[model samples]
Target: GSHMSWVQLGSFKAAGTSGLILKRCSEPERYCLARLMADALRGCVPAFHGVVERDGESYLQLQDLLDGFDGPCVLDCKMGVRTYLEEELTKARERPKLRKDMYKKMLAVDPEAPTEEEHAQRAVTKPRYMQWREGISSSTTLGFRIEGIKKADGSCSTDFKTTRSREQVLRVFEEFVQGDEEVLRRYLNRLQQIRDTLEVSEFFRRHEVIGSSLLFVHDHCHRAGVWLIDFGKTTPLPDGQILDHRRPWEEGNREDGYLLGLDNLIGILASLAER
Candidate 1:
């Protein structure tokens, strides 16, 4: 069946090779282009084995799923949506590890939206946080969905609802224990690395932030990643060049949503540690 944008059809082997997932592309053209961008990204992007058309539809042959960063089996799922990340971080902006110090240096160098004043003003007056909570709590309001969430007990939930206390939000990351402080630092570092790559390649696009399953293949448990995934909404910059305008948070732009998206995810993790 299709999960997210890819439909998994059993595994296939050809020419003595192994570990390939046979899948159909739900949206042929879009998936094709997404994979094409992935091909260009090479190491940064997951490998798309190949795309084939069958019976008036397109199927995608994907390489054995593995962490693009350096870990194996960290677990997979949408940790949170863009709305949840932005809303949660807004309320808990001062949460430890998510505070100004968390992104101080990067903010200094990069052009960020929602400046200190803007962020402050938006903090209390308006509240998406409460809205989501109400939606999740209501039996009929319909909470925003969490596409996939995995558990250590060998269970997975797709389309999990957001709840009032927002406890379900933290449940997504429960598969992995809170490592040391460094565990989070490493995660932040990876976010910066991904952002840097996108900026340099001029592949910046307004895409939703979806968590990746990253490996701690390097130093300690703290140093980790699950770099953002799902490039379906991503679009390459025109002519492979940078945009001259300020990012969404700054100058009221939403163009660099990916960058801002990553920033909020970092804050979400910080809130976890604060707990």
Candidate 2:
């Protein structure tokens, strides 16, 4: 259920023998952002070749990060203090779309979460649901949230909706890497580079990045890599406005905690690697 949103955003499939991936494009804005990221942050993102239409459905053709790996373990971490955009919250306040599905999903996790009004209504607005979702997970406090994990054996798990503590997150990271110090150090080094790159990235500076993730992958051979993926919710701010991504988000301030999450991730990995 934690990965339901990921699935709703897009689906991925390997392109036969091409070392590429075809991600179903649900939003034109995502495609445009992918193209821009490909041009600006090539080293930290999958190469976007172009869009392809098959059977009337469009897909974004991107380089598969797992192309050369043998039995890779993958971890998807949703980066940011806020996943929903401010405009989304604004729109929710204005129109208020009631979602029974989200309310049901919320109840499944914590039956006591709903208010008396929410219980009587049997539904909640998107912002109400989203904010509650963020509060229940690490996103609200740690500035990042783990969406899913896939082991080298192909086993997968997405039941981390309540993993809110730094200790719990570190344990998950340890399990993801199987206590491989080399792999852990590799991640730390790459993440450090990514942090440095983001500080100067023109593309990053101009956009309010939301719902983006850091995808970590490593093979049995210990070759590890990280990439930035998903930009469907990412949008450019108005002219003359730039975000300080490390700061906390407010109603109008567009800070998404991308850098803050990176810092925490780097710290966690460094702790594991050194010890």
Candidate 3:
């Protein structure tokens, strides 16, 4: 599930001119990506403006950095289903506490209507048959379209694609890791700094890095860059060890999960670099 925006078409001209992206934010997980990018990858991604509520629906605003680029492109499903599942479960555990706390406050205000313990438990729980949105496999209430692929090999796969120029950008990944010693040195250094910032430092709260994955953006220009995407839906790691998304009671659940996720992704980077 990519970031969704409901553009105000009449105001779109001014908004785009002003470098602003207007998005609907009634969806709880809507702003996760913005929050993550702003805190973690400021220079690499678009800047985020804050949120505002009006006319009954909430709206989140952001800087329109994409306008600066030519031939903008997106790389989707960079991380597979397993990681997506892991993060979702982690978030599931944390959400209950949020629900519980809110319910407690509500109950406190009107003590006569409900029992504290029952209401607290009810408040902190999920509705029946809950499923995650914003993952690779989730489909949309939003519409979809199919685009034709023109591959010489005449092959297709659900998991990935074979395109005329994929091998080149594919190198933006593997080759960047494997080819040039100087480039690799710089790249690894930059990556390590990011790892320390999220995994080692106390800069952000634990769940800030949840559902994050390597985000690669390409322009038709000679240069391009990588970013960490989808930070808005904060959760935990795939493994139960650190910030077990399942174990909200643990002190290290959230941050530890982020470290685990970072390590997992870095491990993939290392493997790709070697390959």
Candidate 4:
């Protein structure tokens, strides 16, 4: 559901030129939301320039996180207690679309996850599948999950999909920074700044941010930065409804637990910074 391409505009070897990335737009709402965040969140998010059409498709022009680094190490952590939207769950309950693909995915992770009824039917609802997906990873308990990582050596891994435990995640963080206390402190400070900005941002206050990721990047030179990315699933809450963003979600509640996830991430990074 994600695609990106590097875009080189004007002269390739210009002195002040930096890399730009074109990401395929998910929806119109995402485009508007990204524009809003670009203005409000500023440095905490990738700068959104505008939209462009290429080969009969539309793409968002975004600042490349990998622009200024040589062999940057990138980490994508999806922050939330639940990834799916409340409307997705509601529609799943109303229409009840059974998915064999989800069942197969569930079976691959835990063979005993499906009930006898679900096993017999060989399908499960989207909400059920999403809940099970969160339950199996650190998403449910820790409020965040590591989605992917690419080291400075160009080695990459997405095997942390099933990684669930504070110790395990902390170990990965250790490996990521490789005992660089300065880089760790920089990350912690940046995360705290992001936390502070989110508290006062009008866009964040009005929107139900889901399926968003904190993109952590650094390189061999130890130039570290973190940005909030992936607003595809983010949407505005209904009028008169406000989300706490730290509370547990229920059928009616639109709580995304974004702040809770940020808190946990900061806690883990702080622990590493002190060591």
Candidate 5:
């Protein structure tokens, strides 16, 4: 077996900020999204294998270049370098494009109904039986809403929604690929679908190239990638990968940046991706 080193990630400062971060592995350990991500990290890190399995979160697996990651921490998942974005995107677009009927039923619900959100969610398919809160940010759970999609029950196929105005959706792409701008430049059409958008990157100078997808990646790579993380946002070409934001009409943007502490988010992913 390969040697596995628990290279300290960093404080899960971003998590639980909007909700309770489930880090306890005792009999009372709550199997929530944070825990789920921790498990996924354990599964993939290769270094953590053969180690006894536990049911809690750790704060010593990551490092934060942005905040100095003063405390020990092990943050979320990236799957792999810039590759995970493409992997998840292909999973979203090709496999989950909704059938015409699915969309019809999906959008037919009463947008004004008291249960409209829940009612509309009922049509989607969610593979992970994730249990999260009503409205937390940062760690999808803190204020997370129920992803009404049915679980993958063999008879059901998971459908993803990659919907949004061109601008916001592009912002998502850039955000998700936050560290590899050069890679993002390869997938620009992802945002071209929209005819008008105010979200254009302000290229301050010829070399500045503010609006290019690549900028988002490099900036976040030097910044966010310091920690390991991903968002539903998708940009085009600079990263040349397609991530459909984990949902169609959903557009994949986590409400955390505005609601939770983005500094903590920067701290978390930067540390997680530190290697």
Candidate 6:
């Protein structure tokens, strides 16, 4: 999710590819990543014990179910009680986060059929390829699919119908985000992430953008329990605003709510201390 205001929780790359939530931890790096995760799950997801940073990368560090990013609470349900479904409707692209090849591969998509532009760039008979969103100054992505995991391997597990071309994914997200099915999926994933983060300590935060942070989720094995995945968004909170991003008027201009978010990590960590 290299979009203007959002990052992909998971990359929607073509089948078998994994897209994950990412963070740069640049500049205001201290608590931003921690807060990012906290704000994301405030009421939607659960709190964890701690987070970690590696090779300059910051990530959720939920290694032990009893002791991780947040307090180790035996989730209400043994499996899980809630799931998450992200909802994103494309608006006119004012800025492109993914350049040509980058965008095409953003989703688990097969490169589109070469276009007229490709014919022009053709090498003798057939050119290798061309910019996917050609001619158009920016893409008009009116819709997208909420890609899902096809396997426990994360990235390679996306076998669900992604993109809004179909309703299965959408329906699943809208209904399942709060349902038992997703909670169970999250539970399993959380259990796996523990070994990856919790086992190790001395982790911190950083500031900067990751090319595709979700790759960490895809490539790394989950020794940790619940990997904190941060999902925070802003339209224009400085002056009191948050855009809808779906409507033209709500695009960049949103009447900000009183609370944009915390500016540090303490709030994130403190949430767990209570338990």
Best prediction by lDDT: 2
Candidate 3: global Cα-lDDT?
0.39
**TM match of model 4 to true structure:** 0.90
TM-score of each candidate structure, all chains considered together: 0.47, 0.91, 0.44, 0.90, 0.21, 0.33
Candidate 6: lDDT of 122? 34
lDDT, residue 242, candidate 5: 30
Model 1 C-alpha lDDT per residue in residues 25-70, reported as the tens digit of each score: 6453345335446542445544565667556655656544432322
Residue 62 in candidate 5 has what lDDT?
A: 22
lDDT of each: 0.40, 0.81, 0.39, 0.80, 0.24, 0.26
Is 1 or 6 the stronger prediction by TM-score?
1
The 10-residue segment of model 1 with minimum total lDDT is: 1-10
By TM-score, how accurate is candidate 3? 0.44
Off by over 4 Å in 4: 1-18, 32-39, 152-154
Residue pairs in candidate 1 whose N, alpha carbon or C atoms collide under 3 angstroms = 71-215, 113-249, 113-250, 114-249, 183-222, 212-226, 214-225, 248-253
Candidate 3 vs 6: which has more TM-score: 3
Rank order (by TM-score, best first):
2, 4, 1, 3, 6, 5
Candidate 3 local lDDT, 13-45, one digit each (tens)? 223325466555534345454445555545544
The parts of candidate 3 lying over 4 Å away from their true place are: 1-15, 26-45, 52-56, 77-190, 201-205, 235-257, 267-275
RMSD of each: 14.1, 3.8, 13.6, 4.5, 18.0, 15.0
Tens digits of lDDT, candidate 4, 1-275: 01122222021111122566667777844555455755557779877777677677766777777777776778899999999888888788678899999999888899999999999989999889978978888899989999988754446788886878887889889998898887888899899999998888777877788899999988778789999988888887777567778989787778899999999999999887777
Q: Which window of 10 residues has the lowest lDDT sum in candidate 3?
A: 141-150
Candidate 6: tens digits of C-alpha lDDT, residues 29-59: 3344344444422322234334445565554
Model 1 lDDT, residue 198, Cα: 55
Cα distance off (Å), candidate 2, residue 175: 0.7
